[PDB]
Design a binder for this molecule. Structure first.
Ligand SMILES: CC(=O)N[C@@H]1[C@@H](O)[C@@H](O)[C@@H](CO)O[C@@H]1O
Ligand SMILES: CC(=O)N[C@@H]1[C@@H](O)[C@@H](O)[C@@H](CO)O[C@@H]1O
Ligand SMILES: CC(=O)N[C@@H]1[C@@H](O)[C@@H](O)[C@@H](CO)O[C@@H]1O
Ligand SMILES: [Cl-]
Length: 325
């Protein structure tokens, strides 16, 4: 299915760079005038303009002991304040070189399946001035009571992270074992002497290993085209998995490069006269689900975290028997 920004918008991770997009208009959040160093009391506006290389369009959510629920302009380090210093009806959002306070708190929230910018501990949300679902370029953003779907924002990741590790939460780590039983053709010796007979089985489709990372909305982070992580696909022993997807994916597919079992079976069986045999392959499959924490690093080595669900199918043991028919 196609990425649907209204149902799939991720909640931003604090300390990571984001672009902010007004979903209904597709316009981005800019400082008015587009400077990398906006002046104090410069309004936040919506503008169709977009360039991934423009640091002036990057925003960072902050939530720490010194800055509780605040929003920072990346290129300037200025915070997003209500003009005049307290949230109220039609208070313009501005950048200002001063720390946030309780009466300036701003965060992205999920309400009825969409993400909005909200003044924490209030019913004031971020609206375009005039309330249009399709505001004109340079329309200022304001605080106003209540929300409606046309006010939704999408936080688009604006930097590339490294996936350092994924740690499974074993308290909810569930393994189901299933035997996959595969039979060759019947081979009969219709001669009057014992015959050594070549019997082959192809199991590629049956014994496909896989792993997936799943998210309720979407991964929401950029980590490059592929990344490798060790995952405990059966018991505690880590297996190398290569994942590839996009920040927009709700399921990131992983490849297991090293198979633990055989997918081509070639047996040489002595069949007595008049007798018929088959090769029987029994392959143990571990289907595993576990909540997990992804640990990612910024280029400067700041650690952030993302919850996921790890699902995997792994064929880990195999037996081959000659069975009579
Ligand atoms: C070319 C250029 O930087 N133009 C910018 C535009 O992209 C947008 O940021 C706007 C916000 O008020 O300020 C300027 O017009
Ligand atoms: C000291 C003080 O409260 N200053 C605030 C500043 O932090 C910011 O909120 C600004 C927005 O217009 O309003 C005032 O100047
Ligand atoms: C009825 C209506 O759409 N009213 C809107 C209001 O909800 C809010 O968006 C405001 C922001 O300036 O613009 C208009 O007044
Ligand atoms: Cl609406």
């Amino acid at each position: 299915s196609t990425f649907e920004p209204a149902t799939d918008s991720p909640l931003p991770v604090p300390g990571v760079q984001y672009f902010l997009q007004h979903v209904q208009s597709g316009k981005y959040v800019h400082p008015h005038g587009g400077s990398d160093m906006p002046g104090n009391d410069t309004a936040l506006v919506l503008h169709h303009g977009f360039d991934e290389k423009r640091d002036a369009l990057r925003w960072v959510f902050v939530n720490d002991a010194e800055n509780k629920h605040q929003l920072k302009h990346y290129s300037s380090g200025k915070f997003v304040h209500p003009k005049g210093g307290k949230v109220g009806k039609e208070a313009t959002l501005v950048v200002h070189s001063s720390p946030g306070r309780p009466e300036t708190m701003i965060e992205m929230v999920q309400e009825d399946g969409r993400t909005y910018l909200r003044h924490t501990d209030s019913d004031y949300y971020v609206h375009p001035h005039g309330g249009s679902p399709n505001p004109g370029d340079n329309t200022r953003l304001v605080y106003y009571s209540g929300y409606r779907p046309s006010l939704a924002f999408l936080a688009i990741p604006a930097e590339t992270l490294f996936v350092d590790r994924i740690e499974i939460h074993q308290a909810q780590a569930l393994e189901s074992i299933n035997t996959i039983t595969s039979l060759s053709d019947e081979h009969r010796n219709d001669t009057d002497q014992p015959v050594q007979t070549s019997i082959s089985v192809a199991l590629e489709e049956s014994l496909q290993d896989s792993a997936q990372l799943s998210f309720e909305r979407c991964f929401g982070l950029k980590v490059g085209s592929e990344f490798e992580v060790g995952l405990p696909l059966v018991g505690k022993t880590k297996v190398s998995v290569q994942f590839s997807g996009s920040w927009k994916s709700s399921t990131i597919k992983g490849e297991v490069r090293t198979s633990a079992v055989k997918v081509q079976i070639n047996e040489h069986v002595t069949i007595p006269p008049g007798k018929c045999v088959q090769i029987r392959i029994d392959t143990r499959r571990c289907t595993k689900t576990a909540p997990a924490t992804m640990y990612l690093r910024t280029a400067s080595g700041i650690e952030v975290q993302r919850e996921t669900t790890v699902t995997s199918t792994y064929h880990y043991d195999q037996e081959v028997h000659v069975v009579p028919v």
